[PDB]
Design a protein around this ligand. Structure first.
Ligand SMILES: [Zn+2]
Ligand SMILES: [Zn+2]
Length: 80
């Protein structure tokens, strides 16, 4: 790792951020951005839970409880 032949001949690729598409962070710095960026997004920081009524309904684990009561008869319309 201190050799005379450096790896990655690419100018360091930019990885897209799952938290926000406006974030393009270099591969080596991406893991760090992955850590900090979720802390700025509690919705994803608390992870997503799968609705037992519908697999498309992935909600923050803090809101899953509220979503269950709001998805009793299903058809929970959120931003749709
Ligand atoms: Zn980000
Ligand atoms: Zn649901």
């Amino acid at each position: 790792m201190e050799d005379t032949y450096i790896d990655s001949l690419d100018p360091e690729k930019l990885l897209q951020c799952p938290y926000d598409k406006n974030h393009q962070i270099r591969a080596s710095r991406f893991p760090y951005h992955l850590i900090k960026c979720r802390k700025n997004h509690p919705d994803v920081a608390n992870k997503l839970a799968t609705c037992p009524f519908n697999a498309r309904h992935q909600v923050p684990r803090a809101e899953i409880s509220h979503h269950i009561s709001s998805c009793d008869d299903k058809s929970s319309i959120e931003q749709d």
